[model samples]
Target: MLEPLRLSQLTVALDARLIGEDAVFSAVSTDSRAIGPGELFIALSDGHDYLAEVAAKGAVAALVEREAPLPQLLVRDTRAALGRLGALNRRKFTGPLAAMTGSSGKTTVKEMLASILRTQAGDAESVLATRGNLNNDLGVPLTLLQLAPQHRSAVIELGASRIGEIAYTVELTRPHVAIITNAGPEKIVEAKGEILEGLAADGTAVLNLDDKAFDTWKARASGRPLLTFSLDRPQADFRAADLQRDARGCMGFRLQGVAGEAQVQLNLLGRHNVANALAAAAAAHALGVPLDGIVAGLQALQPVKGRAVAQLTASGLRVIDDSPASMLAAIDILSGFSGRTVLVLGDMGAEQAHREVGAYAAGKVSALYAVGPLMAHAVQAFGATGRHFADQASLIGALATEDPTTTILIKGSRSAAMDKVVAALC
Candidate 1:
């Protein structure tokens, strides 16, 4: 979009038959309702009828699978065509761009890197990062199209919904730096390695030194500059030293990089985030951000919603809304808390896995509360006190009367609406 995207410019990338007179477009949109003047509207779903509607919005053109009243580019599939446009826009961009992917912690790492880059640019609006969970095929293209003249950098997250998904998106992004947040479960390391396929020739590869697949990922970097981070590994180019936590669970650590060291205090909770922070710092360092900027940026990050966001009532009770983090990680965070610890768990699955969870909570929490058949079975195996409630409401009613000093963690699948408990109590 920086160079004024034109139909003729997309001739090679789109690989489609042209049905309209060549024209310049200032932007692209997939939604007919949101199309604006000079924007190329891509009809992605069943949108043949919206061609004129997009035209009505003053859209310069449309990319369509079927024809209608508007000037158009005809392609075999609109989805693939959208990616072509995204690929084109990325090529025109000259700023620093990074693509990140892994089995877990990608979103957190994405936010962390964005924080660091935003500090480098001085204006938060000048940097574009993958917003929310929009890292899939459709979301990746949409995110790339969001790149504008003002963007000094972009940090994109490539999520794997299926095999080669990262390759598809990363190839379009063509990032200057690629980061693997964590090489979780050695079996999936190969899938996560797909990010390196599209890394720029001179780009740096950032990997987790603590992950067992570090050597595997380093080898795949193919002699690229490999920057490694860890929680405490001395050999890591970036590492967290003198790590400490507070009563509210914020992590404080000395961020030690190869050439400099700075202190960082993360507002988010848990031990795992130390590694997540290190991962972000490493990626930002790879992009050439100074240690001071990285330190200030990491400190500026607030807890993302539903990911270990904790609050305290006037009565001294601590409530943690950690519905979005993986279950065992949330449980581990609560395990380290002092006094009257409680876990309110709902059905995290269709069933059966709670058996491991039930038994896992044994010494981790002072009491276990459950609200579904799956969780009901989970609580039975809890070594300490366990209670199964009829529903979230009844469970909330019981928890509302919990001891004033209790530290409780409420978490479950999105189906459980567990945040309601936090909303009610807070």
Candidate 2:
């Protein structure tokens, strides 16, 4: 069993102090909604703003950044202190840590890596990963605090909308292996430039050798071995040859590399998934997992929820629920469907700066239904080829006229409330 430490001990070890922690803590939480009875809530500046609310939600104690007119345990720098605690905890527990990040397919690759880790560990141990899209500063610390006694491996997903996000997360986890799936011109815009800054020199960096950004990043990450995977350009540490996509859009390919070749058949639809599989395979190989285990892991992997999740409607209509975040690679996946395709797009908030949705809707989608403020920009880019709806209600009201034969792809940022639109349609 893992010996639980007190928040006071963590703070003191990191040269920090607890203002009011006469009682020790068993667990830590950043989210007020998830706080349990004995959990020590780290109410960072933003979280401290809701101190009264979180305290009412059963948080026994809180690490506050400021006095905030509330009863709490004040800490100088909540972010830094959280990292210090995580680093201190990591010292006692030694395990294989793998991190994955990219503009596209980060979650899928993270989950895939988790699955591969499970196969390698052989059910005796558990694996940890970023829950949902919780890959930010607070999220990273919270994930670390969730680590249990028997966890032998961890597959962490690192994310960033701007510079330093990935770097900060890396400093907290310090993964032994890292995989940067293909970067696109969306959130991070080709993981090489800003995203690659997150990588640490613990082990091999798995890269998409075909991506132009890979060359720049590879050059920057000198002295470290690379496990490269690509379908476009070869000369990778791990390469895939003879790729074929089925009628349902599932892909089949053969993986070739230092780990030996294995036929890979995946149920997930999209070329990006194929890249994700290769990335996971490379990470598993780096961890010394055999080809059979790697293959089983990849085959067992499923599409991440709210990210290119495919399902059939009651009307026999095919729908792809990719309402997580918008990326150029995701748009490319939408382009693979046959028959008339309708793209339901929404604003990506302050995060992404991609023009792929408009570009694809203009040339590819048979009908484009856009909603929210970001859709206005997409309409301008798409000219008259796209149509905008004031809200989801209006869009769902018009679904009857939509061609039944058309394959519909629902995509946008998480704030788009895409579930409402999908639920109404169902």
Candidate 3:
């Protein structure tokens, strides 16, 4: 809709016959459900995975890898091709590009920055943000292509389990501002290493001075412009001098910095979230946003749905949905809850290298409700503390009768979908 396919600068080097010139791709989407009418459908895979179904619905054109029996654009390596498309789009962008990477709170910080950009930049701003957990190569590129001529700012979330993943995203995003929220046990070294990589690729690096890996990443950044923040330390760019949590999940704190110290309150629960707000404030302040706007932004921030979402069930029970993003981080956040805490845990799907989740769970959580085929091993690991549930139903049934007054923390891998238990309880 913006203009004709200006393939001259955009790195998508494809040589396909032009079927139509004025076809308007109002939005870019990899998922079939998000495809708009007259949009160019990217069928860059085995044409069967979600694309084929949507192409039949109404796609203007399809970017394909093989000779599909449908109208498509052929390209090898959909992942790299997506990156090329993103880089091409980046050429027209003139506003601030910000990147966020950390072991915990990357998504929350990305969303907070995006919200701030929306309010500050207005209709002229077309902010491209990393969707869901799509901080990887494929997802980052797809997010890039979503940018239009009206875009004024961008907040890209960069995530990695292995080495150099953050560096790869940083190179593609080319962020003017960068932020690292926290470093936990989940590949903390690798995640910290990526923060350094991000620092290398970005103009300014906003780091958590309180994080365990702070000094290491600081050394890597060397001479770069760095705005440091902390909850414990006082001499930070954005430091929370006083932090207190009220009865109803509200957090009050004072942000101390060079601009001037200001009192801020957040509706989000947990003391750990105060740290997330400080990081967001530091990044926002570095971008020239005022203290009042940053304070309003942090105060208006909401909890991410599955991570630390608090819900009250019809059965009169509290469900803390911090569904297993990372074991150590989840444990840290859940520790703030009062009363008898019941934890419903499962195997650490793809994050086994990070730590023994079951062992950590057994030691910290007051009561255990574990599911999946691997629960036996977890049960053995916990020894006397383990209370294995063959499935979700069994776990729920046990929780209903045993210590229902206890605050329940339902957390597991996304593949497990522990929300079903929350739904049933509610």
Q: List the global CA lDDT of all models.
A: 0.82, 0.72, 0.69
- Write the candidate numbers in order of decreasing lDDT: 1, 2, 3
lDDT of 1 by residue, 175-263 (tens): 98898988635547877888998986678998988888888888878988788888857888888888787556678888786848878
The numbered model that scores best in TM-score is 1
Per-model clash counts, in order, read 0, 0, 1
Off by over 4 Å in 1: 49-58, 184-187, 323-329, 336-338, 345-363, 369-384, 387-406, 411-426
Q: 117-225 in candidate 3: lDDT tens per residue?
A: 6656643247667768878877877777666766677788888767666777666777778888876464666555565564444477888887777877787777788
TM of each candidate vs. truth: 0.84, 0.75, 0.72
Tens-place lDDT digits, model 2, residues 265-377: 88688666778888888988888899988988888777767766676667767777776234555566667777877778777763224354576557766767778876776
Clashing pairs in 2: none
Off by over 4 Å in 2: 46-60, 68-73, 120-125, 183-202, 311-332, 338-360, 367-426
